[PDB]
Design a protein around this ligand. Structure first.
Ligand SMILES: Nc1ncnc2c1ncn2[C@@H]1O[C@H](COP(=O)(O)OP(=O)(O)O)[C@@H](O)[C@H]1O
Ligand SMILES: Nc1ncnc2c1ncn2[C@@H]1O[C@H](COP(=O)(O)OP(=O)(O)O)[C@@H](O)[C@H]1O
Ligand SMILES: Nc1ccn([C@H]2C[C@H](O)[C@@H](CO)O2)c(=O)n1
Ligand SMILES: Nc1ccn([C@H]2C[C@H](O)[C@@H](CO)O2)c(=O)n1
Lengths: 229, 229
């Protein structure tokens, strides 16, 4: 089939940067970016910036955001499956984040910080289970690439990138997401409702150093990791 | 196929009352009630009462409620299709309200009353279109029964029934829903995104009088209306 790989990491760890060198390594590699742009301008399929609304008032807008974020991701991921630039021969589909990071990293953290209440979190989990019982199986992952960077590196890369919505994100929030990533992907101690994930191979790339100096090594490790699935 | 009929009306017009006499008229008739009970106790598939949360603070909770309401309805409606008490022979499936009342009566009214903002309403409409593009076609209606009662009759029936959450519902809100029902189902002037609905037969039963005295006439009219689809 199409091999499906998610790329996971903290805010500003270097996912779009990493994603932008993949297509040139192999004509058979496709990428489904996180639709962060539709989150910044909500429009049917100039509107609200729901990402901005969550960060300005997260106890008001987290559920709405998290629900919209994950639905719009599932849609973009499905559309690239049947998007039949498969046929292909040796096809790999890279997902920028996943429905699993949406729920177990981001939505979970907001619930634990009291930005979703029990009713919101119950609803979200029920929607998320149900959505994946329909429109998953097909989204299942063969592998995960974890781009690992300290919270402080990420706080600096947020400044570098300059996305308006992220400029007030405190270190404390990024550290919370860091530990949840480390639990899921380094220690593999996270309990999820998706049994096969516990067994999915993970490649861990330390991307704290500068991208130019790391590039050659990263590519070797990506190609080798791919060849084993 | 299975004939699908929705029963539409204002809050407390007499939908559950009407629904409770259907099964005894014909062994082939099934009913999918509106899951108002799961709305009053949110639980995965003692929790929050999201219905109560919407009415106590509708500008905070309308989007969440309206989104949960309609997803849980679509799920109960699907599950009764494949619920294969079809086979049957002459099978009729009655839906207590529909995805169309959810959007064009209730969600629309809350958006127009500023209980959803543009971003919420954009998201809701996008979710609703998308949900029906997947999990509809199969939910399409052959007919609609409109149970018609004045807003004042309904305000009285709310008192009679005594559902705690509805006791503070003002006449003004019920009147708004009344006119939207009258536009969709009596005048047929409502524009929707579902072209076939404009042509769907509608039976209109005036249920302002007492149910006991009306019963015999209602049954005649239901059976005849059914025989013509
Ligand atoms: N390894 C790296 N070295 C130097 N800069 C990086 C590196 N990775 C990302 N950046 C920079 O950090 C910012 C965040 O990168 P981005 O790819 O947008 O992260 P994400 O997709 O994870 O938010 C950008 O300014 C980018 O130029
Ligand atoms: N035609 C009618 N005559 C007298 N009472 C009615 C009639 N229809 C409904 N009722 C009463 O009105 C209340 C609301 O009815 P219900 O069936 O729960 O409405 P809905 O399902 O539309 O909310 C109940 O107390 C019920 O006994
Ligand atoms: N489920 C998600 C996914 C992403 N984000 C945020 C992190 C970044 O601020 C932006 C883009 O990744 O969206 C989020 O809050 N929840
Ligand atoms: N889409 C819907 C459907 C129903 N309701 C309300 C009306 C009644 O108070 C209760 C049960 O019909 O739910 C609502 O606000 N929105």
């Amino acid at each position: 089939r199409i091999k499906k790989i998610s790329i996971e990491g903290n805010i500003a760890a270097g996912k779009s940067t990493f994603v932008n060198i993949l297509k040139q390594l192999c004509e058979d590699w496709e990428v489904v970016p996180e639709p962060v742009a539709r989150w910044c301008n909500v429009q049917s399929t100039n509107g609200g910036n729901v990402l901005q609304m969550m960060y300005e008032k997260p106890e008001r807008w987290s559920f709405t955001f998290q629900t919209y974020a994950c639905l719009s991701r599932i849609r973009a991921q499905l559309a690239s499956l049947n998007g039949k630039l498969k046929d292909a021969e040796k096809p790999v589909l890279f997902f920028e984040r996943s429905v699993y990071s949406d729920r177990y990293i981001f939505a979970s953290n907001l619930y634990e910080s009291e930005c979703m209440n029990e009713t919101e979190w119950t609803i979200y989990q029920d929607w998320h289970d149900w959505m994946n019982n329909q429109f998953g199986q097909s989204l299942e992952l063969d592998g995960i690439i974890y781009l690992q960077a300290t919270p402080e590196t990420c706080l600096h890369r947020i400044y570098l990138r300059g996305r308006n919505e992220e400029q007030g994100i405190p270190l404390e929030y990024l550290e919370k997401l860091h530990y949840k990533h480390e639990s899921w992907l380094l220690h593999r101690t996270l309990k999820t409702n998706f049994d096969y994930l516990q067994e999915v191979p993970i490649l861990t790339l330390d991307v704290n150093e500068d991208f130019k100096d790391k590039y050659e090594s990263l590519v070797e490790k990506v190609k080798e990791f791919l060849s084993t699935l």
